[PDB]
Symmetry: C3
Subunit: 373 residues, 3 copies
């Protein structure tokens, strides 16, 4: 028999052992109230409770009111596989679908998109297998109601789950990174740079034990300086090795770009859906990269890290969502609290005028200091 | 042996049992008249007659004159598999390739595209297997000539067609949908809304008997009201079930979008290549969704439907092309006639001023009626 | 067992026999000098020397200084598989990654992209298997230094390479094509057109012996006339056949477009990332097409050709990069020299005024000749 194969060729092959199912917010009366009842502040709800074996292969969500009125940073999505009491997916729902902070913007990637109206149509094509059921939970951590929650959870019911199917995991993390004690010595501008041989102070976006592979990252940086935020290298520790086997060159480099960019760009596997649009790199940037053709495999453990500036010198407000598969459904670290992951104010002309004043004082307050002394 | 696989990894594997063939409109003399002879009005022609086993995996077409001079709504493409006297593909050629009405516009999706010059380069990457030959027919239903028809039909000749290969089907449908007897009660604005528990009056875009899976839809709506046209739910009846197992929440929702959008957007699997660009949602919108990673499977039958407004309250000029695979090549319903599928005029300021006059009369013709009473 | 499969479904399957490795320009001291030492003019260097079995599945590169200061047409990339003393990949690095001439511009295709800042982030997702090692070499053919060369070479080490894995090949070619002796008779404007039954004078972008399949072409045309450059048909000779089995209709047609286009357009498999932006088609156009779902297979040999204007009538500055797989790593033809592949000057208003003068003289220099006589 011919071994011919590719996406469109295989689509033409008849498939066995699959049956479509869908859980949705469809109005059960047949009317047009095709959304769930409102969520009060703090309310949790199981929106999908599936029994047995299957594979989720399409999720769509939308929410009313839209951002900024109702921040999608403050609505949590959690997924529990195989009857476990812990979630293997836990994230603010906006960041999970590639919508950072309390913002909205259209973009398309192969697994995740935020489509019209202006980023409110959320869709996900990651496949999520399960053997002993699946539970999807929504939690309203906002101070106002979720007036209307709309969704589709499309999946294939299977009489027999193929034996090598993994379990989908996703974890949101957030840190306000700490500058070096000597200050933000990026590019050696304010002081001498030093080597980072260990990755000890790197930001950690993923850490797990098991067998599997890393498949993606949504990276949300809010930079409080106009200085370039992305000199930092990615560094991966596979299967408990002492020296990281995968070491990068820069953050834009890791995201398949170069030369401190700040342009919107789209590829199915990587892109910049939201750029800072201000002096230097001051403000917010969202970057993503999916490792679909090129996952990062591990047989025992994986620790995915990235420097926050060269040798971790910068103070950055950084959040990430990491996506991966592993052989069984495992637990995640504690989630950042609502207060911990709150979006930060944009640094503005008043703040920078105060920096200029402290800088003028450090130079002896000469009446005609320009600013480049 | 390693089970490593993905699109780019598998592309690097040597393939057995395939041989390239191509039927094209190439000038047989070696000159530069690389198109077919003109088609007179009403003329049919078999443009490709393939014997034996194979898989079509790339089609490109262009036509002269371009639209609006020669409407691609009035040139029919038909495909016959395995020596059958009925077509398993039947559609106006523009709508088949994602060009609605008598229009032209650039767009790209994974299986279908209309590229430059301004939507005239038509391409298709759906795989189309056949065991006992294939015939592709073009029919000119325009009142003028097809001056020049250009094409490529690329396929792989196979000594043995792999046994689980399905057959590609596509069907164009059109309806001028009927409003409810009480009128167009969308959003409960003109009167009370009622439930749709059965889907009895839904628009039907696909209905077949066999084993296979649905893989796509091109949806062409011409809305004669500024009111939002897409509150309607998709509803699928799999294998003759009485209650539909897949029920949606809205039309934009089904197309992975939200909040009554009218923005151009592109994803390999879904998008809005043509938007209404007028008050509310008055005018023409083209939406598509391909179910490549997430097909709708069936073992005995499938009926794919969608409401035309909530509880089918709206009058919409709707046409669709549905794409699917099934185990054997089957027949399609009768095609809409040329008159039935004719594009409708755009509702304009004169028409709406006449509506305003009837509305003023219904309010007693107060000399200072504003319009929001 | 279910035969369910597709890209996202298969991504969820656990994989065996693969281990990630990466060679990069990471600063070995842990500092922030994450690029290689400068290359002097003429200097060659092996940047990656891998032993054993594996598959490269992601490459990223950037270079300092950027274009036009340092032309990426004058930095050569070469790849040697299985310990061979000849390269199976040989190309100027800009053209290899879809950046023609000495230019820079953002674009994205599925296998190759040039991302921000303004086309400097080069990435490649072609899979490149090898059984007895791999060597990647960079040669500086510029008259100035490569100040900083940055890269990632991501690959999977395999204990056993699956047996049907091919070898990746890529070859850059360049020709200043010769007009017909009677002149540039395109469209029969300057004289009678004649048939091309043999393809004898066609431009050759690929020629090899072995078993495999063609997967892509980057086509870089610099047209010195405003006349349309793309009437020329693609013509393929498979396995030494006398009459080419695959014959096209036009160059834009071959690139899934139509009607002499000159619009930027993007599809994962084809597109126009750089268009001429001048009268007619005068100037530079970059077109690409990847044959991922629809490769051109061969069991013994392949010769890929295209006319340079109908019946090869035009003088075009043409360069191409062809990409393919075959069963073993084979040698390539001699590369064009630096002088041979040098970008040509743009034809300008002064040049055309001189053409007008020769044309006026040919018409007898009537004092009021308009130009359309
Ligand atoms: Na519903
Ligand atoms: Na409903
Ligand atoms: Na760095
Ligand atoms: Na031809
Ligand atoms: Na020809
Ligand atoms: Na609805
Ligand atoms: Na490094
Ligand atoms: Na470093
Ligand atoms: Na031609």
């Amino acid at each position: 028999q011919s071994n011919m194969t590719n996406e469109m060729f295989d689509l033409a092959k008849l498939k066995s052992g699959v049956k479509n199912k869908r859980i949705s917010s469809t109005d059960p009366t047949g009317g047009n109230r095709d959304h769930l009842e409102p969520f009060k502040p703090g309310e949790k709800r199981i929106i999908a409770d599936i029994k047995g074996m299957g594979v989720i292969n399409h999720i769509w969500v939308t929410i009313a009111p839209p951002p900024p009125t109702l921040s999608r940073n403050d609505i949590i999505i959690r997924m529990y596989w195989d009857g476990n009491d812990y979630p293997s997916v836990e994230s603010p729902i906006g960041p999970f679908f590639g919508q950072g902070w309390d913002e909205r913007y259209n973009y398309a990637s192969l697994p995740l998109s935020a489509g019209p109206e202006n980023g409110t149509g959320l869709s996900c094509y990651f496949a999520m297998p399960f053997e002993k059921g699946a539970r999807i939970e929504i939690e309203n951590q906002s101070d106002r109601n979720i007036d209307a929650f709309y969704f589709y959870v499309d999946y294939l019911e299977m009489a027999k789950l193929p034996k090598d199917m993994g379990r989908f995991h996703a974890w949101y993390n957030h840190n306000l990174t700490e500058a070096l004690p000597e200050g933000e010595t990026e590019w050696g501008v304010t002081g001498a740079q030093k080597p980072n041989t260990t990755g000890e102070r790197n930001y950690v976006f993923m850490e797990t034990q098991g067998k599997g592979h890393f498949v993606g990252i949504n990276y949300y940086v809010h930079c409080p300086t106009p200085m370039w935020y992305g000199e930092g290298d990615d560094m991966w520790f596979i299967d408990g090795e002492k020296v990281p086997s995968l070491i990068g060159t820069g953050t834009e480099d890791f995201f398949n770009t170069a030369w401190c960019p700040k342009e919107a760009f789209s590829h199915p596997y990587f892109g910049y859906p939201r750029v800072n649009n201000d002096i230097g790199w001051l403000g917010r940037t969202h970057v993503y990269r999916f490792f679909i053709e090129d996952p990062i495999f591990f047989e025992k453990s994986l620790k995915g890290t990235i420097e926050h500036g060269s040798n971790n010198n910068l103070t950055l407000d950084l959040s990430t969502v990491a996506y991966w598969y592993q052989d069984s459904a495992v637990a995640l670290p504690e989630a950042p609290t609502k207060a911990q992951r709150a979006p930060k104010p944009f640094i503005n002309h008043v703040d920078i005028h105060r920096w200029r004043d402290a800088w003028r004082k450090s130079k002896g307050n000469k009446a005609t200091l320009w600013g480049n002394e």
